[PDB]
């Protein structure tokens, strides 16, 4: 047991943590793979998402090579403070932490040749700028940018370890409002004023589930709009009945629009759902406005002609509006 | 690596972090440049915005001059705790932190001539007093104030390293509700009774996007107010129809006004939007009063004249109200 203890002591005796492996030599190649535990929140209000992942980094450090021990040394995670580790960070993360119960979720595993396996369990909130013009028929693309903070490509190089299999767990992710259509791994270099830097990107494509919004948002608006046409089938002289129906459907449309929380009132810019709700609001507005002409053109001064045409124009125009809308947004 | 290791140990050996560069000599000039990552939030309730940036400080320290190595030493971020660094702070900063995953998002880079480059990735919530009287047609000016804590211009000087190009990344800012109209850099000395203190200011001007409020607030109120005029074209004896229209428009207007109070960010003083909703509420209130007068002057005691007059005055006066409103606010 002391032989292993002596071996570890030798490695850290005189070890310089301020100097990267092969300082001044070829850049140290760091390979990364990720196991995604879950995607928790995908918020349009904050335009971000939360991600819990197992993040592994592999690199070779000759200063940590050991012989005579035919085993890979898994060490207490507190030894990571006594080694050089890449200054990797997530360029687009908003807030992140490494889990710490019961201990810090950190792993250091050595191999005889000097390879270091450095694993962390990280929950990171990452910025995902979402395009909500077509909401709720929208498709998003959320990324995770992995970059070196201080070292340029002359010092450190990144690669996905295992190619396109370097990220696992995506198939298991379940989102209450999206489906993971695809994910991609990219590797590139980004050039700044201070030099070029290695970049690894992981991106997902998210397609929103539309079935729920049809029953919740679109269907009630459609039915109320059809109700407003019941006025065209009531006698022109039933002023109380036709005004009550007309103004109460206008009230109903406002009710739907005001506190339909699926409209995302906390995000103030125009979306596809907004256009549709206002399209239906204009129709019910016109159905009641049509009776002003019908009532006036009889009592104030043909009367059946306006109602006769509205029985066709309103159903026809609303279908034309729906056709144009769905084609444009689908 | 040993040669550089001994070179670095030479620099720190005998180093005194408690003394500024050129202690007792000319003031140390600190150049600053900021690479803006994002403005995550801008909240009117708290009157502040959240900013992510790379904050860089650049100065010269003769005690850190090294010779024989024709390279700029990029060191581990932990070496920053063993050097002197400026005591820069943000005057209007409510809360801020340096990102810490995977390592502390901090950078130290030395140069042979003793020049130190010091970068930090900072998320800060900075106070921004906003004048929301013209909300939602308001334009805000949010600043970041950078100052020295315990040094005067006799010891430390600040400047924007690179002139007006000292700040980059402004085109990266994507606020859903605003658009960055302009930004400025200001360098000045603040003179108190205790002396003169260096000050740097970065300020952005934000113009709020109005399109959302056209669809959500102004357009529904205009259509409901117009709908209340349909009463003027109905018979004076259709009391149930004309009262139901007038009273239901009043209920609809309150619904729009009261529920908008919940969706909007609770600013408790009179704004531009409040004046428009109250204007439209008064108009529909007066239209219902118009029928009460018509009903009374007929049954309680001409009648067609009042409706004829109201058919013109109400649309005309509402147009005048809009003209006065938009000129006084646009």
């Amino acid at each position: 047991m002391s032989f292993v203890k002596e071996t570890v002591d030798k490695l850290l005796k005189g070890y310089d943590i301020r100097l990267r492996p092969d300082f001044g030599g070829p850049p140290v190649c760091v390979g990364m793979n990720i196991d995604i535990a879950s995607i928790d929140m995908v918020s349009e209000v904050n335009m971000d998402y939360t991600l819990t992942m197992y993040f592994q980094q592999y690199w070779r450090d000759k200063r940590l090579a050991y012989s005579g021990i035919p085993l890979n040394l898994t060490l207490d995670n507190r030894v990571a403070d006594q080694l050089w580790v890449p200054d990797t960070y997530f360029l687009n993360d908003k807030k992140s932490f490494v889990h710490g119960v019961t201990v810090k979720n950190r792993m250091i595993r050595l191999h005889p040749d000097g390879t270091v396996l450095y694993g962390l369990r990280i929950t990171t909130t990452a910025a995902c700028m979402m395009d909500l013009r077509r909401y709720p028929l929208d498709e998003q693309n959320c990324t995770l940018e992995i970059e070196s903070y201080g070292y340029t490509t002359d010092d450190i190089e990144f690669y996905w370890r295992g190619g396109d299999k370097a990220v696992t767990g995506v198939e298991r992710i379940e989102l209450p409002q999206f489906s993971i259509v695809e994910h991609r791994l990219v590797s590139r270099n980004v050039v700044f004023a201070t030099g070029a830097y290695p970049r690894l990107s992981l991106s997902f494509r998210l397609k929103r589930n539309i079935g729920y919004f049809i029953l919740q948002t679109y269907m009630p608006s459609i039915l109320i709009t059809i109700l407003s046409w019941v006025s065209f089938w009531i006698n022109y002289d039933a002023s109380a009945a036709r005004v009550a129906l007309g103004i109460t459907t206008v009230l109903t449309m406002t009710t739907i629009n005001t506190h339909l929380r699926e409209t995302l009132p906390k995000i103030p810019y125009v979306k596809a759902i907004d256009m549709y709700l206002m399209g239906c609001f204009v129709f019910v507005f016109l159905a009641l406005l049509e009776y002003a002409f019908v009532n006036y053109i009889f009592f104030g001064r043909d009367v059946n002609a306006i109602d006769r045409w509205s029985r066709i124009v309103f159903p026809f125009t609303f279908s034309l509006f729906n056709l144009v809308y769905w084609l444009y947004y689908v | 690596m040993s040669f550089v290791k001994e070179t670095v140990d030479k620099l720190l050996k005998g180093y005194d972090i408690r003394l500024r560069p050129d202690f007792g000599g000319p003031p140390v000039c600190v150049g600053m440049n900021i690479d803006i990552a994002s403005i995550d939030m801008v909240s009117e309730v708290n009157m502040d915005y959240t900013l992510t940036m790379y904050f860089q400080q650049y100065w010269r320290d003769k005690r850190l001059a090294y010779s024989g190595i024709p390279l700029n030493l990029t060191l581990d971020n932990r070496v920053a705790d063993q050097l002197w660094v400026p005591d820069t702070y943000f005057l209007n900063d409510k809360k801020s932190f340096v990102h810490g995953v995977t390592v502390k998002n901090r950078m130290i880079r030395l140069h042979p001539d003793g020049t130190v480059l010091y970068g930090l990735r900072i998320t800060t919530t900075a106070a921004c007093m906003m004048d929301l009287r013209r909300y939602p047609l308001d334009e805000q000016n949010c600043t970041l104030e950078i100052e020295s804590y315990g040094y005067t211009t006799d010891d430390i000087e600040f400047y924007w390293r690179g002139g007006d190009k000292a700040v980059t990344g402004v085109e990266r800012i994507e606020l859903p509700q605003f658009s960055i109209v302009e930004h400025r850099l200001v360098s000045r000395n603040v003179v108190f009774a205790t002396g003169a203190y260096p000050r740097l200011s970065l300020s952005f001007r934000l113009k709020r996007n109005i399109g959302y409020f056209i669809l959500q607030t102004y357009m529904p109120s205009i259509l409901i107010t117009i709908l209340s005029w349909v009463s003027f074209w109905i018979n004076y004896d259709a009391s149930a129809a004309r009262v139901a229209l007038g009273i239901t428009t009043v209920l609809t207007m309150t619904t729009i006004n009261t529920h908008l109070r919940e969706t909007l960010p609770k600013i408790p003083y009179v704004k531009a939007i409040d004046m428009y909703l109250m204007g439209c509420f008064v108009f529909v209130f007066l239209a219902l009063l118009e029928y009460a007068f018509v009903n009374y002057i007929f049954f309680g005691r001409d009648v067609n004249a009042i409706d004829r007059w109201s058919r013109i005055v109400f649309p005309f006066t509402f147009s005048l109200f809009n003209l006065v409103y938009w000129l006084y606010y646009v």
Partner: nanobody, 124 residues
């Protein structure tokens, strides 16, 4: 992906003005920053200007500043380069490029993913 095609190039007398349009189709939201470059006959691509997604923010090269302007129209997915007070040195092939949201600085061509076939502008 994104597809870019520039237009509006031609021959203009020195001291005049010209307008170049760049039409973008595809995942234009994934590449919100549009930058303008110019390729001189012998030199390399030189940064000219850039504009954000909202269009309220813009940046220009020092020499080109106060003569050129950049405007955006997300409705038509077009960015315009209004060039005024043209000079003989301005003769070059003006390229339109699109940059991703996290690609570093504006002045480096390597950071732009998609390029157009730059229209030619020559000043007499």
């Amino acid at each position: 992906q994104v597809q870019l095609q520039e237009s509006g190039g031609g021959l203009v007398q020195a001291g005049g003005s010209l307008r170049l349009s760049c039409a973008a189709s595809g995942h234009t939201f994934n590449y919100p920053i549009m930058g303008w470059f110019r390729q001189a006959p012998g030199k390399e691509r030189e940064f000219v200007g850039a504009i954000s997604w909202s269009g309220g923010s813009t940046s220009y090269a020092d020499s080109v500043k106060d003569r050129f302007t950049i405007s955006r129209d997300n409705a038509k997915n077009t960015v315009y380069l209004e060039m005024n007070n043209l000079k003989p040195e301005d003769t070059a092939v003006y390229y339109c490029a699109a940059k991703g949201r996290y690609s570093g600085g504006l002045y480096y061509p390597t950071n732009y993913d998609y390029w157009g076939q730059g229209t030619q502008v020559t000043v007499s």
